[PDB]
């Protein structure tokens, strides 16, 4: 109930005029009181529509101001959207900044004038510095200045931070006022005509610099900001990658005293094991050269910060480094050209001096792995292999974005990238032809996409036809099935929904053991991803072909084989200005259904091939090997204790043993630590990488202004947990400014606190971080029933596409490929089912969601609706509440710290209860209905549909299930078995969890099976109503925990819930109408 006050002050601050008026609107769930609210509303609207003072009535109707609930505030004020300058003249008395063109390697990557690089606007492109975000610089500056004004009178350590950031913003604003403000278009892009007389790379630096200075809480932060802001104005290609590089060595210097362990994906079990740090001499010399480059770049304070820590090499002072390690990824992207980003990868040194004894072994291991993967399904003749075509045709929605192609649905034209729609287009003209695999050559080279991530290189993406997916699908899914239980496929091992977060290193770390960890991200254009890899797979297919008797399967295999033939020679469309290059690339990269797991395989085979050479000189027991995409690590234990000389000689031998296969590497050997893209360990303590740029994005998504605020807040929460902490108030200011909407030149709308933090499809953040907030009142239910009434919408584009000819053809081919003679009973069901996966197509979502926003807007303006009894969550909590009883408790300290970078209160929680140990099927994958879905498809279906589907009669369930590609015999058998009744509870668990972000964010990190949490929750057991006792125990846990978070102390509980209300609620259970947005979730592991 505080956000809105800051909103009011922002409104008062930004406009400031007599003519600037401020117009609240309220609502209440009580009829009489609502009519008085309507009255107040009316009179206020009138007064607003008559240039009358509004401030007088506000006292008379004080009751509405105190007890009624706000929605939004409008603002009518005359201005020509400037105001930044009109405030800013005072805050700009520092010195402006001068570029240095001889910093970046290229010439055009310097921050020189646009016209000196793009004289004509017809050849201009802002994409090499496009922020790619629907939020203005003016918004950012306005937010900063209002923040600065309000935090101008606090007197504490907070003020010492304020003076620091104030000095920084002076340094910034002097530089900005030197030239001026770039002006946004409707799309928040910046055209040539504003930047025409200004430096090209001023905007991203500006935005990134704002992002940095808003994340200053300490003295060392101020040092970092002063040392980066002035150097990030020039270096834009070798900076975050640079300073973030020494960390990989630093982790190998901290003696472990106390450890954390894995068994199964979150089984934590601490260990007091001690391990020393046997560092060689030459890695220090490597580090010194890196520091010489660091100083050569213009760095003074950060060598000192790296130098004064080494006197002790203690882990208590070490988080500074970790803090620093996240500041490298909050400086921005190196948004260079597709070409030049490829040429970071497309430099090759291929030699006829490597072994042949090695590649054959490599190929064989790949072959053997393929056979291990594919022995069972190829042999037992699974339906999904026979009907691979239909399988891929269902799983088109889970594919990549194909190249743009011109379609027409009756009487329109569309440029879709969705490959299912491409197939639909090709069906009409007789072009659907999955048996004839297209070539990939001079006559038809491939387009590209770029997978970026700051502080690292750019990876590439194939953009293929629709046959390749179909070919790779079935085989790769069976491979995945094999890979669910194989440990070494780290990206693919699971307990059917999890990826192993905290590694598998710490079991056997010791004074006698070592670990070799290695980045393999440049190994895409390499000489070991060409011919042997593919031919090994082809050989494996030959073996598998001789390991089966069915003919459909052999057809599939021969087509997949020929696909691998075509992928062995593959050319690549790449523009450069106007003309187009096509380059010989007969090798492997990302952008495929096969690439990820296959790269994991290939790296596994490669390292297995490398690993047979240390054995010529050392005896070790391979305890573990791991591969996850762009890195891999193997730990090994010896017959004796380790020395410096053995590590050095092993390292040189490893480097040269990669050199024998013509393979570059920064080889890294250690005893205690690793560093990889997504996480890293030092001294038996897990840290993480906080690298998500906020004001600069990777690529241009499809979301609105609205949802990008929610994703940015989710990323904020994540980065905060990682360690990189930004001031939450700034984020809130941005959220209000991005959900604010301009209806005219002078009308602007501003939503409120109780709309963005309320459980709906529009939730954005929370009033108290790490805690969803609920509604004990009528009013949150009331507006939720309204928004649920409005969430269900239509897309006329989808309606007319489903009424076209291509849709009919598609349905006909589906039918005659599966079954016939129920042309008016199921086929309509199948059309309705295909609709469920047309909605993946983005413009449909835009139509639907913009429609949702318009419908939303026509009741944000005007008063409220009673919404007709539709039960939701807050009704339940409203009814559960009057049977509680609180009591003061006092818990002890019994859990060990292993995530220092958390806030100390979060750690206090962790230092009193446990960390999570399971991961519940948030999508119901282990459910026996889903083990059918995972048998005939990969598709998710969302928990809205499932939660509804189980509630229906036994008739339309049959139609709905048969419509999903499933045959009739197994569906009938499923209905007879009655396992869905054994799955109401799992589905409801997943439903409530998805609604309440229990497996998404801070609550994803917590053990609800704990004994420590349970002894406070003294809810006796009744039985034969599982839903109630489940939800009661859960809600009570949340109550105690929220009380703990906000107040520190603990409490116990008690709920003698009457059986009468149990029965009254049992019928209210399976008619709930609620929903949470996918875009609001914040996965700590991305």
């Amino acid at each position: 109930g505080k956000y809105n006050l800051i909103l009011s002050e922002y409104l008062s601050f930004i406009y400031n005029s007599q003519s600037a008026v401020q117009i609240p609107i309220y609502y209440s769930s009580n009829s009489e009181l609502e009519n008085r609210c309507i009255e107040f509303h009316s009179k206020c609207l009138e007064n607003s529509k008559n240039g009358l003072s509004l401030k007088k009535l506000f006292v008379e109707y004080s009751d509405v101001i105190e007890n009624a609930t706000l929605l939004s505030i409008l603002s009518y004020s005359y201005d020509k959207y400037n105001a930044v300058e009109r405030k800013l003249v005072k805050y700009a008395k520092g010195k402006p900044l001068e570029a240095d063109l001889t910093v970046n390697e290229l010439d055009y990557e310097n921050n020189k004038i646009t016209s000196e690089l793009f004289p004509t606007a017809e050849e201009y492109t802002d994409l090499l510095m496009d922020p790619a975000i629907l939020t203005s610089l003016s918004s950012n500056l306005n937010a900063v200045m209002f923040w600065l004004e309000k935090h101008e009178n606090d007197v504490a350590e907070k003020l010492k931070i304020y003076k620091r950031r104030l000095d920084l913003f002076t340094i910034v604003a002097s530089t900005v006022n030197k030239y001026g403000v770039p002006r946004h278009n409707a799309k928040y892009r910046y055209e040539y005509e504003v930047m025409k007389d200004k430096p090209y790379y001023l905007v991203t630096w500006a935005n990134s610099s704002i992002e940095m200075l808003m994340s200053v809480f300490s003295h060392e932060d101020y040092l970092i900001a002063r040392e980066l802001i002035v150097l990030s104005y020039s270096n834009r290609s070798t900076l975050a990658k640079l300073v973030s590089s020494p960390m990989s060595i630093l982790v190998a210097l901290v003696d472990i005293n106390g450890t954390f362990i894995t068994n199964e994906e979150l089984e934590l079990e601490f260990s007091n094991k001690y391990v020393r740090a046997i560092v060689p001499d030459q890695t220090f010399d490597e580090l010194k050269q890196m520091l010489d480059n660091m100083r050569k770049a213009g760095l003074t304070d950060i060598p000192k910060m790296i130098q004064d820590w080494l006197v002790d090499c203690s882990i208590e002072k070490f988080p500074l480094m970790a803090k620093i390690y996240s500041w490298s990824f909050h400086v921005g992207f190196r948004k260079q050209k597709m070409l030049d980003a490829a040429l970071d990868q497309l430099k090759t040194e291929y030699t006829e001096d490597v072994d042949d004894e090695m590649y054959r072994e490599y190929t064989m291991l790949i072959r053997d792995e393929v056979v291990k993967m594919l022995e069972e399904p190829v042999k037992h003749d699974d339906h999904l292999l026979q009907d691979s075509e239909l399988a891929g045709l269902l799983s088109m929605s889970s594919a990549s974005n194909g190249e743009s192609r011109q379609l027409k649905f009756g009487r329109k034209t569309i440029f879709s990238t969705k490959k299912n729609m491409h197939v639909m287009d090709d069906m009409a003209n007789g072009r659907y032809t999955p048996g004839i695999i297209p070539p990939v050559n001079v006559d038809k080279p491939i387009p590209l996409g770029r997978r970026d991530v700051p502080g690292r290189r750019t990876r590439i993406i194939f953009i293929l036809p629709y046959e390749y997916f179909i070919a790779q699908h079935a085989v790769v899914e069976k491979m995945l099935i094999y890979a669910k239980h194989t440990r070494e496929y780290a990206e693919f091992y699971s307990q059917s929904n999890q990826l192993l977060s905290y590694g598998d290193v710490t079991r056997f770390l010791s004074n006698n053991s070592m670990v070799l960890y290695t980045d393999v991200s440049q190994w895409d254009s390499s000489q070991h991803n060409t011919q042997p890899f593919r031919k090994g797979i082809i050989m494996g297919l030959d073996m598998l072909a001789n390991m089966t008797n069915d003919a459909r399967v052999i057809q599939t295999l021969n087509l997949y084989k020929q696909t691998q033939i075509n992928l062995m020679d593959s050319y690549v469309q790449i523009p450069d200005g106007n003309v187009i290059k096509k380059i010989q690339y007969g090798a492997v990269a990302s952008g495929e259904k096969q690439t990820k797991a296959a790269n994991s395989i290939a790296n596994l085979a490669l390292i297995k091939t490398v690993l047979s050479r240390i054995s010529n000189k050392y005896s070790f027991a391979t305890k573990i090997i791991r591969v996850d995409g762009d890195d891999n690590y193997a730990v090994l234990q010896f017959n004796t204790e380790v020395t410096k000389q053995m590590v050095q000689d092993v390292s040189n031998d490893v480097r040269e043993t990669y050199a024998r296969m013509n393979t570059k590497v920064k080889a890294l050997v250690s005893t205690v630590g690793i560093e990889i893209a997504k996480r890293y360990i030092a001294g038996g303590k897990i840290f993480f990488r906080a690298g998500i740029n906020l004001l600069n994005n990777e690529k241009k998504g499809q979301s609105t202004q609205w949802d990008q605020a929610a994703v940015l807040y989710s990323n904020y929460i994540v980065n905060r947990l990682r360690g990189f902490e930004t001031d939450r108030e700034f984020i809130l200011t941005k959220i209000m400014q991005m959900t604010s909407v301009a209806i005219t030149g002078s009308l602007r709308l501003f939503p409120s606190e109780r709309v963005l933090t309320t459980n709906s499809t529009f939730k954005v953040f929370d009033s108290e971080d790490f805690i969803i907030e609920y509604g004990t009142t009528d009013d949150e239910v009331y507006i939720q029933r309204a928004f649920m009434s409005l969430s269900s919408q239509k897309s006329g584009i989808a309606d007319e596409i489903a009424a076209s000819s291509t849709f009919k053809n598609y349905v006909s081919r589906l039918s005659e490929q599966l079954l016939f003679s129920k042309n008016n009973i199921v086929s309509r069901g199948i059309a309705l089912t295909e609709k469920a996966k047309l909605n993946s197509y983005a413009p449909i979502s835009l139509e639907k969601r913009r429609a949702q926003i318009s419908a939303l807007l026509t009741m944000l303006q005007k008063p409220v609706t009673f919404k007709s009894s539709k039960i939701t969550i807050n009704d339940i909590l409203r009814d559960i509440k009057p049977f509680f009883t609180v009591n003061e408790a006092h818990l002890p300290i019994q859990y060990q710290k292993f995530m220092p970078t958390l806030p100390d209160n979060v750690q206090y929680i962790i230092q009193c209860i446990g960390s999570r140990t399971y991961q519940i099927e948030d999508d119901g994958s282990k459910s026996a209905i889903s083990r059918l879905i995972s048998k005939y498809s990969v598709y998710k279906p969302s928990i809205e549909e499932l939660y509804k589907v189980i509630s229906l009669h036994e008739n339309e369930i049959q139609l709905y299930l048969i419509s999903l590609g499933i045959p009739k015999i197994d569906a009938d058998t499923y209905v007879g078995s009655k396992i869905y009744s054994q799955d109401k509870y799992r589905i409801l668990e997943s439903y409530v969890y998805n609604l309440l972000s229990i497996n998404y964010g801070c609550y994803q990190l917590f053990d609800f099976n704990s004994p420590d949490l349970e002894k406070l929750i003294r809810i006796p057991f009744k039985g034969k109503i599982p839903a109630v006792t489940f939800i009661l125990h859960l809600y009570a846990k949340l109550e105690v925990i929220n009380h703990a978070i906000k107040n520190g102390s603990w409490i116990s509980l008690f709920c003698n819930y009457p059986k009468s209300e149990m029965i009254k609620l049992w019928k209210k259970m399976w008619n709930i109408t609620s929903l949470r947005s996918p875009y609001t979730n914040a996965n700590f592991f991305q």
């Binding site: 003696d255 020393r276 010194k288 130098q307 080494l310 204790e641 380790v642 020395t643 410096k644 000389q645």
Partner: peptide, 28 residues
């Protein structure tokens, strides 16, 4: 400055001494 840096290189030897190494070195 860098005189003290080379002294940092030297003083970052005495710390974190392994035992097997000094044994084999006395022997060697």
């Amino acid at each position: 400055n860098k005189e003290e840096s080379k002294q940092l290189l030297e003083v970052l030897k005495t710390k974190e001494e392994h035992q097997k190494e000094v044994q084999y070195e006395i022997l060697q």
